[PDB]
Design an enzyme around this catalytic site. Structure first.
Site, PDB file in Angstrom:
ATOM      1  N   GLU A  99       2.056  -8.865   8.600  1.00 56.27           N
ATOM      2  CA  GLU A  99       2.202  -7.421   8.722  1.00 56.27           C
ATOM      3  C   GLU A  99       3.059  -6.861   7.596  1.00 56.27           C
ATOM      4  OE1 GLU A  99       1.807  -5.986  12.777  1.00 56.27           O
ATOM      5  OE2 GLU A  99       0.117  -6.858  11.626  1.00 56.27           O
ATOM      6  N   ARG A 159      -2.235  -8.649 -20.862  1.00 57.04           N
ATOM      7  CA  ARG A 159      -3.199  -8.155 -21.848  1.00 57.04           C
ATOM      8  C   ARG A 159      -2.502  -7.382 -22.972  1.00 57.04           C
ATOM      9  NH1 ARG A 159      -6.393  -4.319 -21.308  1.00 57.04           N
ATOM     10  NH2 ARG A 159      -8.003  -5.071 -22.747  1.00 57.04           N
ATOM     11  N   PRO A 191       0.816  -1.218   0.000  1.00 57.31           N
ATOM     12  CA  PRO A 191       0.000   0.000   0.000  1.00 57.31           C
ATOM     13  C   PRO A 191       0.860   1.283   0.000  1.00 57.31           C
ATOM     14  CG  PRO A 191      -0.648  -1.526   1.785  1.00 57.31           C
ATOM     15  CD  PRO A 191       0.690  -1.985   1.247  1.00 57.31           C
ATOM     16  N   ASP A 229      -9.391   0.328 -24.794  1.00 55.17           N
ATOM     17  CA  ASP A 229     -10.036   0.119 -23.489  1.00 55.17           C
ATOM     18  C   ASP A 229     -10.040   1.442 -22.693  1.00 55.17           C
ATOM     19  OD1 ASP A 229      -7.345   0.060 -22.109  1.00 55.17           O
ATOM     20  OD2 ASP A 229      -7.158  -1.858 -23.186  1.00 55.17           O
TER      21      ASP A 229
HETATM   22  O1  LIG Z   1      -1.084  -4.587   5.977  1.00 56.69           O
HETATM   23  C1  LIG Z   1      -1.101  -5.687   6.418  1.00 56.69           C
HETATM   24  N1  LIG Z   1      -0.490  -6.812   5.713  1.00 56.69           N
HETATM   25  C2  LIG Z   1       0.153  -6.652   4.381  1.00 56.69           C
HETATM   26  C3  LIG Z   1       1.598  -6.851   4.421  1.00 56.69           C
HETATM   27  C4  LIG Z   1       2.237  -6.662   3.123  1.00 56.69           C
HETATM   28  C5  LIG Z   1       1.506  -7.287   1.933  1.00 56.69           C
HETATM   29  N2  LIG Z   1      -0.028  -7.340   2.065  1.00 56.69           N
HETATM   30  C6  LIG Z   1      -0.834  -6.363   1.419  1.00 56.69           C
HETATM   31  C7  LIG Z   1      -0.579  -5.867   0.153  1.00 56.69           C
HETATM   32  C8  LIG Z   1      -1.628  -4.972  -0.019  1.00 56.69           C
HETATM   33  C9  LIG Z   1      -1.811  -4.159  -1.221  1.00 56.69           C
HETATM   34  C10 LIG Z   1      -0.915  -4.258  -2.244  1.00 56.69           C
HETATM   35  C11 LIG Z   1      -1.132  -3.483  -3.335  1.00 56.69           C
HETATM   36  N3  LIG Z   1      -2.145  -2.665  -3.359  1.00 56.69           N
HETATM   37  C12 LIG Z   1      -3.014  -2.562  -2.376  1.00 56.69           C
HETATM   38  C13 LIG Z   1      -2.875  -3.315  -1.261  1.00 56.69           C
HETATM   39  N4  LIG Z   1      -2.397  -4.945   1.041  1.00 56.69           N
HETATM   40  N5  LIG Z   1      -1.912  -5.792   1.912  1.00 56.69           N
HETATM   41  C14 LIG Z   1      -0.428  -7.699   3.467  1.00 56.69           C
HETATM   42  C15 LIG Z   1      -1.725  -5.976   7.781  1.00 56.69           C
HETATM   43  C16 LIG Z   1      -2.279  -7.206   8.130  1.00 56.69           C
HETATM   44  C17 LIG Z   1      -2.713  -7.079   9.470  1.00 56.69           C
HETATM   45  C18 LIG Z   1      -3.349  -7.969  10.378  1.00 56.69           C
HETATM   46  C19 LIG Z   1      -3.668  -7.539  11.666  1.00 56.69           C
HETATM   47  C20 LIG Z   1      -3.359  -6.231  12.061  1.00 56.69           C
HETATM   48  C21 LIG Z   1      -2.729  -5.359  11.169  1.00 56.69           C
HETATM   49  C22 LIG Z   1      -2.402  -5.791   9.848  1.00 56.69           C
HETATM   50  N6  LIG Z   1      -1.798  -5.144   8.809  1.00 56.69           N
HETATM   51  C1  LIG Z   2     -11.222  -6.306 -20.078  1.00 56.72           C
HETATM   52  S1  LIG Z   2     -12.587  -5.667 -19.403  1.00 56.72           S
HETATM   53  C2  LIG Z   2     -13.198  -4.572 -20.482  1.00 56.72           C
HETATM   54  C3  LIG Z   2     -14.021  -3.512 -19.771  1.00 56.72           C
HETATM   55  C4  LIG Z   2     -14.450  -2.334 -20.667  1.00 56.72           C
HETATM   56  N1  LIG Z   2     -14.442  -2.646 -22.093  1.00 56.72           N
HETATM   57  C5  LIG Z   2     -13.530  -1.178 -20.408  1.00 56.72           C
HETATM   58  O1  LIG Z   2     -12.436  -1.113 -21.038  1.00 56.72           O
HETATM   59  O2  LIG Z   2     -13.918  -0.343 -19.557  1.00 56.72           O
HETATM   60  C6  LIG Z   2     -13.633  -6.934 -19.176  1.00 56.72           C
HETATM   61  C7  LIG Z   2     -13.955  -7.069 -17.713  1.00 56.72           C
HETATM   62  O3  LIG Z   2     -12.809  -6.911 -16.880  1.00 56.72           O
HETATM   63  C8  LIG Z   2     -13.243  -6.406 -15.624  1.00 56.72           C
HETATM   64  N2  LIG Z   2     -12.338  -5.331 -15.161  1.00 56.72           N
HETATM   65  C9  LIG Z   2     -11.294  -4.854 -15.850  1.00 56.72           C
HETATM   66  N3  LIG Z   2     -10.639  -3.903 -15.121  1.00 56.72           N
HETATM   67  C10 LIG Z   2     -11.256  -3.769 -13.948  1.00 56.72           C
HETATM   68  C11 LIG Z   2     -11.092  -2.944 -12.742  1.00 56.72           C
HETATM   69  N4  LIG Z   2     -10.103  -2.044 -12.647  1.00 56.72           N
HETATM   70  N5  LIG Z   2     -11.964  -3.084 -11.734  1.00 56.72           N
HETATM   71  C12 LIG Z   2     -12.980  -3.949 -11.814  1.00 56.72           C
HETATM   72  N6  LIG Z   2     -13.190  -4.734 -12.887  1.00 56.72           N
HETATM   73  C13 LIG Z   2     -12.377  -4.701 -13.973  1.00 56.72           C
HETATM   74  C14 LIG Z   2     -14.673  -5.945 -15.780  1.00 56.72           C
HETATM   75  O4  LIG Z   2     -15.516  -6.821 -15.001  1.00 56.72           O
HETATM   76  C15 LIG Z   2     -14.941  -6.022 -17.268  1.00 56.72           C
HETATM   77  O5  LIG Z   2     -16.254  -6.448 -17.578  1.00 56.72           O
END
Ligand SMILES: O=C(N[C@H]1CCCN(c2cc(-c3ccncc3)n[nH]2)C1)c1cc2ccccc2[nH]1
Ligand SMILES: C[S@@+](CC[C@H](N)C(=O)[O-])C[C@H]1O[C@@H](n2cnc3c(N)ncnc32)[C@H](O)[C@@H]1O
Lengths: 237, 245
Positions: free
Chosen positions: B119, B157, B92, B169
């Site tokens: 964590e 893709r 994150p 897209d």
């Molecule tokens: O943040 C946590 N775990 C992470 C550790 C590193 C990788 N994980 C992760 C990646 C992501 C992520 C990655 C990319 N984009 C959005 C979210 N969210 N969580 C799990 C976390 C887990 C947890 C459990 C009990 C109390 C506190 C806590 N913090």
């Molecule tokens: C490849 S996509 C094409 C979606 C649409 N033609 C567009 O470009 O906005 C086909 C499916 O992938 C899913 N999808 C792709 N990207 C996404 C995102 N960021 N969040 C949620 N669903 C996603 C959707 O459910 C969508 O129906």
């Protein structure tokens, strides 16, 4: 029975093994906090190889998911939810951006039906008719909505009572104390709870300021938080 | 193969979700995409050592130790061979993944993705070995396996001959996508817009662009603040807004 009922409409129900067989999602299913069901539009087809896509009106690349199969699966899932208040969410990049705030809101629902699209998407008339909310996991395009659905369920399931703030996280350290002449911060080795709390808060604030200043412009900070962040900035090369 | 991906995860078998299904699966078959996994639990000091341990200074949860991660990454690096591999931690605290970011990631020869659990991973591992940190969004998950899979899906893709269309897209032209329609002509007292049935290719292009602009304006005006509007696009968008009713 269960806190959260989730029905997923997907032509790849096998993919949802990633959350049913692993992690807190799996643990919540076994504990009965989470009920997870899948509904394959491919099964509610009445033809050859159970085709669920068609060519788009007006031409263009790609295919579109037909209404009829989707209609089947969704009707079945709606029936399966019983007398629960089920929100129907379509996963798409055209949807509202998922954030932790959005996740907390979604965790207050008793039932979710998640539609995972494939191809170019589903028919706009289906969305107009059946879909309550559109959600996006981010500004990128995936090949389908299965992973987005699973992301959503994982984030939401974490907040369910007895499953386990606008800041970034502090750094984390564990054994050993020293590794290749890189030692863990002394403050974490002293047993002092107050110093450790202060240091982590300050590191959190510092990293947030360094990488996500936008998160600081939304959340107003406490007096202690302002001092700790100020000290971080002024004591950094 | 065009793209070599190595994933460092304690749940390598979870990645059957992308290896066995969808375009990722068919890219693997076709040989555009090589997918490998490296379980750090198999790279510990001995087999009585877990991959995780208690956080220094206390707190909830456990942290992933550096020794296991270091081993797995050495193995993955070796396997990638001659290729320039970029080591990405899914976190994150990372850069927000966007379609722009995805296009750039698709130019790499090899990616090694570290999926953390608990964590997180020891900060010293990140300091030393991680080239890029990426976030799939501003929400917290239980691990980096789904983020990793998201990243692989999005990138795969854009691989020449993987597939809809990668250059038509959402987010490509800075806009959201137009709506899509298929059979039947009428469903639940709702007809396919006539433009798509009778119209010529110029009418349809203009209609789809206008819908794109209109939806973006309705749901994602922030996208329109970054990408400017042309004269034709302003007129098409004005007309969209006034015919919204
Ligand atoms: O943040 C946590 N775990 C992470 C550790 C590193 C990788 N994980 C992760 C990646 C992501 C992520 C990655 C990319 N984009 C959005 C979210 N969210 N969580 C799990 C976390 C887990 C947890 C459990 C009990 C109390 C506190 C806590 N913090
Ligand atoms: C490849 S996509 C094409 C979606 C649409 N033609 C567009 O470009 O906005 C086909 C499916 O992938 C899913 N999808 C792709 N990207 C996404 C995102 N960021 N969040 C949620 N669903 C996603 C959707 O459910 C969508 O129906």
């Amino acid at each position: 029975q269960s806190m959260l009922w989730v029905g997923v409409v997907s032509i790849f129900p096998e993919m949802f093994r990633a959350i049913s067989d692993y992690g807190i999602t799996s643990r919540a299913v076994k504990q009965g906090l989470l009920t997870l069901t899948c509904w394959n539009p491919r099964v509610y087809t009445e033809d050859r190889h159970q085709t669920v896509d068609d060519r788009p009106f007006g031409g263009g690349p790609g295919m579109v998911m037909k209404i009829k199969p989707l209609e089947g699966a969704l009707a079945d899932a709606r029936q399966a939810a019983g007398g629960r208040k089920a929100k129907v969410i379509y996963l798409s990049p055209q949807g509202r951006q998922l954030t932790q705030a959005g996740v907390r809101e979604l965790a207050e629902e008793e039932a979710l039906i998640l539609i995972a699209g494939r191809y170019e998407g589903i028919d706009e008339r289906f969305i107009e008719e059946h879909v309550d909310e559109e959600w996006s996991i981010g500004d990128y395009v995936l090949s389908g909505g299965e992973l987005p659905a699973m992301v959503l369920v994982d984030a939401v399931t974490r907040l369910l009572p007895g499953a386990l703030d606008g800041l970034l996280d502090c750094p984390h350290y564990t054994r050993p104390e020293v590794y290749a002449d890189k030692r863990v911060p002394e403050v974490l080795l002293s047993g002092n709870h107050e110093h450790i709390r202060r240091w982590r808060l300050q590191q959190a604030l510092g990293r947030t300021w360094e990488r996500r200043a936008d998160l600081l412009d939304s959340r107003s900070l406490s007096g202690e938080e302002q001092k700790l962040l100020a000290e971080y900035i002024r004591q950094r090369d």
